[PDB]
Amino acid sequence: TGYDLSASTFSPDGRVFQVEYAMKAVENSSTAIGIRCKDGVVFGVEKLVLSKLYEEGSNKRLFNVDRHVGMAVAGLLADARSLADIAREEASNFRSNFGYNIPLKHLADRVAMYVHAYTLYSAVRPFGCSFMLGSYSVNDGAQLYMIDPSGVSYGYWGCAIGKARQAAKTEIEKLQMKEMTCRDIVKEVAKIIYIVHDEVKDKAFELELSWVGELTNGRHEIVPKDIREEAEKYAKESLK
Amino acid sequence: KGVLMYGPPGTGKTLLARACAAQTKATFLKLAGPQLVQMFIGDGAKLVRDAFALAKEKAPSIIFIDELDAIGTKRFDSEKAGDREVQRTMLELLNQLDGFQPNTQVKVIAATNRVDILDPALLRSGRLDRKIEFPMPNEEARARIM
Amino acid sequence: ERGYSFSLTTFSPSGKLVQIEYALAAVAGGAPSVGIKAANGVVLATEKKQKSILYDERSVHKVEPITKHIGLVYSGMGPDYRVLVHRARKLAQQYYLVYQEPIPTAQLVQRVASVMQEYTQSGGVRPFGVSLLICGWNEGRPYLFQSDPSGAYFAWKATAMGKNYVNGKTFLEKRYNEDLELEDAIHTAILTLKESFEGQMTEDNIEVGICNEAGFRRLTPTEVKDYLAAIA
């Protein structure tokens, strides 16, 4: 051994294990999925009720970076909201210097170069978080990006991060996200995260949904209660 | 054909194998890992083909191998030194399991607790098919265990 | 970020700096190169073989000029060479902005070798893996100096660096005298590079640069073909 202690050393076959070890820490966080509809992006996070003593609305794994940009995280939660602070701060420097709202192909570029910068030195560790960025503009449409702890970003029609990643994105491609608007998506977002996480592992869990598009007039916010109650009404019909 | 269980050392691997020895009424046959290691040459190799010929005779039979990382350690190229006689017992265990003249009469249950040590020649798909892992008990299983 | 701020080059218990001894092993596995001064100018000749026919040989250069009258070749590893070239290009300018005079070739080697010694003691760095040959004609008389990764320097009449350098130095010892012209030293520099090259020594497998009192210059492959012709 000895070839895997620092992030400054390659292996004798040419790969870095400190990044791969931090990628393994993501699959112990639960599940965060997000797909984009024809005219907007819908996030979705199932939230484990660890004990009864916590309060409904605690420790949200679903942030709010800018007025139109949303973030759903998966990983070590202290590093999640630390990456959320620099992304919230990066968009403020764009509007102050250039005058207008930051686009997603630039925002996820500036954040991923900040994540990549900790995969080079021995003085710092790689982050233990993977997360998704989605938004809607009236001149660019809906956007959906995703960033690993190594620093690689791509566009997606729908993605999934958490424990059951392949077992979640198997059913995403059963949908048709090219033509559905962001109303019937909300019922289909919830349904594919009820079929995952058998009740042997967890007793009870919490649904948390997010929502952006021109139906929300460009601003990012949470779903209302009645709409996610319709999805929770559309929960127990997967037993047939 | 061929199952493999692995994981942390206290998760219960022998406990399934001792369970199956009580349930099915077949010819159960067990092995230690370092039992197939002999001072003279070719005796550990002879001892493998004698065991599978015995389980060939009792045609409903399953064979169990505990601590497979004793003999299934990864091969390596080196001059001046290095063990070789252990690989011969491994390379027949590759062949006498699977390859020329195959059979469907015996089933292999293998158990180790470290995987990265093992030779990829014995983890192919045909020799050890279903590689299941044993995770540590999460919360609820510990309430069931004690 | 920051650095390490500790020397990773220490004394052995036998009293030898081991990393400098290893850097001389990388110098000895480089391309062979010879350098000869003879009474009116210095000849620097090296050996440049592309690995395949796909490479553009007119793109990079082994023989580099430092100023109007100073050239410089190497025998070591590639990317370390271009660093201390750009360093030595700059050092010749700060001498010129103070004194309004082209730098003497001795004073350049005073300052290039001071960089290499400073770089084998400071914190968190491995030493260079190149040795140099520096020519030039200051005040009539020519000069030929050789540095090393340790930071020392010498004043050679004729020497060889690279692979089979111990055979070239025996060959030059039986060849060189005090009285040769520049075109004679060119002919014996090709005759000593033929000791270690392949079968075809064409106009683009080698690279030759000369000094005169007219200044340093580098030969085009036209007259290099004429020198390679009627050779050996």
Partner: protein, 238 residues
Amino acid sequence: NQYDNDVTVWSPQGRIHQIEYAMEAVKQGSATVGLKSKTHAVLVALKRAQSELAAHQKKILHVDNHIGISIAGLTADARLLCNFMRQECLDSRFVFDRPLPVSRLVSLIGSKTQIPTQRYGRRPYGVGLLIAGYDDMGPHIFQTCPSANYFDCRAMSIGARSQSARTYLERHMSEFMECNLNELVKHGLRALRETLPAEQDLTTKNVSIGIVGKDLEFTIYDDDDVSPFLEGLEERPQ
């Protein structure tokens, strides 16, 4: 274990062991229990001592007129975050002339303690902050941990032998959102007699109570004024 030395090094399983060892430091300190009603936020601590003549180490501290905290772990890092806590409250009062909200205070702590959990040669802060306070939204109970992960909760308990206190809080938290200040406190006082050996419980010199209230500034009660609260508890059933 060579993966067990510095905060920078990841485990091959993906769990940084230096963070997990700072969780062992908060499990060494004595227990404390915080809980809230609709209109109040009460936290109760249990002191310890070294000899019978040395005094008892206090744990409840006063941050502001509407925020108080309770510590568990080594006391030197507790005062390091306490002097950061007081400073961030009175400058917001200096700039905006308003009480700084509680949920916005804790996110400053989570960004404060995450920084030494990523550099080289920097320990985490071993500390056990239970925070009680007032926003404009009523009472709030927050807990932190040396993994820089703060939790929103309605009743928690941390310290040595705290799992027994959590089981008491789960089977009585349906009653907490109705009662006044009197039996809200002695609901929490029945949790501290749960986490003790079966012979000594509450002898009026090792327990402290702090309340912030809807028209009540944050007030600490110590070893004489505890006695009105402490009377009115039944005997331990055996």
